[PDB]
Design a protein around this nucleic acid. Structure first.
Lengths: 209, 93
RNA sequence: UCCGGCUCUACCUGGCUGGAGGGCAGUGAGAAAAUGUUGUGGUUAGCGGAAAUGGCUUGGGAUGGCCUGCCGUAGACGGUGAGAGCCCGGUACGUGAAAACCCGACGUCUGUCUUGAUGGUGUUCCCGAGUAGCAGCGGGCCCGUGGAAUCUGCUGUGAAUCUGCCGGGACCACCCGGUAAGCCUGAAUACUUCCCAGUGACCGAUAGCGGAUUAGUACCGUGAGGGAAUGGUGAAAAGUACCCCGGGAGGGGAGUGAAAGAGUACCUGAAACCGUGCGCUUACAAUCCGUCAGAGCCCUCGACGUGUCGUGGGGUGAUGGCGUGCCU
RNA sequence: GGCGUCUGGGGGGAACGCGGGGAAGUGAAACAUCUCAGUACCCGUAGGAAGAGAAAACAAAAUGUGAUUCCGUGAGUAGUGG
């Protein structure tokens, strides 16, 4: 049970949001989070690397010369691996690196990362990033500076909060994620997590229900 | 190129930085211009001395009041034309 | 609905056929060919687009370092004399089509139902023929002939029309399901010669396409066919004016360049291989060519004197002992 | 059969489709049934997709589903096999 007080861009506290213990007070599991983020990065990577083997190189369909009488080593083709310009023996081939991590592991890792962030009170809640209807990167930067002095921050706002997303888009250390797209890698990569009130409420309702 | 033959420019980088000049030949293909009295070389012919092309990013179009600027475009709605303007003062350049 | 003309002929009756409303559909599998208006609907060229000539310092050059500001719906990516959001091309974001084509929409247009519709009663006819079935020889089904069902090719034989026929893994009876021997049908699915926009814990010139360079070229073969090698001066050519040796090639001065230990034989410039100079050693010697002792000579680091030792280091080594290359 | 007049066809294309014909090296530690494989290749044809498609269907007594196609299970199972 941890309390987070909502801050407004005007600079005054609005209210409070009650963080459930099972979502923001679990003991972080280093190995589980490591496995989850490793699987995440593996899923991100695309395996677009290929090489031509001995059978896919151009030509080489004939035995070169006399096996005997020449006095040279016997060769079956000019595309053999030992030949310059020949095929590759065990080269990279297109493949998929995604892993089938169970749902419970991913949920537990995200909960652990969030609880670690909340333990050092790195979780902040706001009503709106900037005054609505017009993006303003200066106002958003000022509000984020007031909220925290860290380098990397994570902003979690709803998919309908276009003004805030556009406002905090261009800041060098700001990453924008949707409440239903929260993941271990993005939370752990960020020093501070800034939650929109509606986004935080949506996440709590989706999870604790 | 946003800079034209006959335009007078101020060099903002290189050995001759800060020297004013007049563009005499421009190369839209190479993004290079030829300016009065800048980037002069010593070619062996006697040994002659004449200018060499300088990249267009090293020059700025100078204003009416001698102030370098970035050039912008405004559209003349009366005749559909499109003329260059200076962003420091807004006057026609 | 109304009107009209026909059901041999005219008169009272039931059925066919045209003309007007009224619908119903349409380039569709359900019939078809067209013709107009309109859609900031799309595609095929583009345009705009914020903010530093900032100060000190190194430097040939700042796009480096330190310190000041500014924009940001734009801190994506490249270029510019070295790591640039504020120099350029651009980016976020808005804008643009005379004409052609593609998507829709509303129409002219076309067909089509209206001479029609409903729920009832007991009987004759029809419901796809050389077809189904059967037999012989085969194919394919988990099924390789097996008790072998369903499907199918060739050759013979060859039926029924609904109490008819087919199937329910030999077959028979009962139940159950369906209605062959006629035809069309969009979507979900497969792919990329080609065009557009991007991506990469893919390669970076013996790699990656055979092909970054004359590349399916040179060359080889009569022919089908086989098939290579070759990237980097410099920021800019400023590519060495002029003098001297030389027939030239090449070079030495002189210059350009930040650098010519960048000279169009050009970034970096290893190894093999070939030289030049210096120090030691070698022409009485039987050497897997080294290793352990080791005199002498030369070099070097300290201390003390004038050369002599030292918790010294190096090079070469006369001489003695030992010693049968590596891999399979 | 000849004559005249109109409308069509002919060839090319990297992959994907459909209908036919259809190997052998290989494995079985030999080999012929079998496998390889209806693969390689060849032939005829299209389309932007093609083919199939509206029960003479499955099912098993459930007062059951209801054209075709494609994907995942069923399942390396029931079976089949010198």
């Amino acid at each position: 049970t941890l309390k987070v007080d909502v801050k407004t861009p005007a600079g005054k506290t609005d209210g409070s949001v009650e963080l459930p213990a099972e979502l923001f007070d679990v003991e972080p599991n280093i190995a589980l989070m490591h496995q989850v983020v490793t699987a995440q990065l593996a899923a991100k990577r695309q395996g677009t690397h290929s090489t031509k083997t001995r059978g896919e190189v151009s030509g080489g369909g004939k035995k070169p010369y006399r096996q005997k009488g020449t006095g040279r080593a016997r060769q079956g083709s000019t595309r053999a691996p030992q030949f310059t310009g020949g095929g590759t023996v065990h080269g990279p081939k297109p493949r998929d690196y995604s892993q089938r991590t169970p749902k419970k592991m991913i949920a537990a890792a995200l909960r652990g990362a969030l609880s670690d962030r909340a333990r050092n009170d790195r979780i902040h809640a706001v009503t709106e990033l900037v005054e609505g209807q017009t993006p303003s990167t200066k106002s958003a930067k000022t509000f984020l500076g007031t909220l925290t002095e860290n380098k990397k921050v994570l902003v979690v706002i709803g998919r309908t909060d276009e003004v805030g997303a556009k406002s905090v888009r261009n800041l060098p250390g700001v990453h924008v994620i949707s409440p239903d797209q929260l993941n271990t890698y993005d939370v752990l990569n960020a020093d501070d997590v800034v939650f929109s009130v509606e986004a935080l409420n949506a996440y709590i309702s989706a999870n604790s229900k | 190129m946003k800079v034209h033959k006959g335009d007078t420019v101020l060099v903002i980088s290189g050995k001759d930085k800060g020297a004013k000049g007049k563009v005499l030949v421009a190369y839209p293909d190479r993004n290079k211009v030829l300016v009065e009295g800048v980037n002069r070389i010593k070619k062996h012919t006697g040994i002659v001395t004449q200018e060499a092309p300088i990249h267009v990013s090293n020059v700025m179009v100078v204003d009416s009041d001698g102030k370098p600027t970035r050039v912008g475009y405004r559209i003349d709605d009366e005749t559909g034309k499109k003329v260059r303007i200076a962003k420091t003062n807004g006057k026609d350049i």
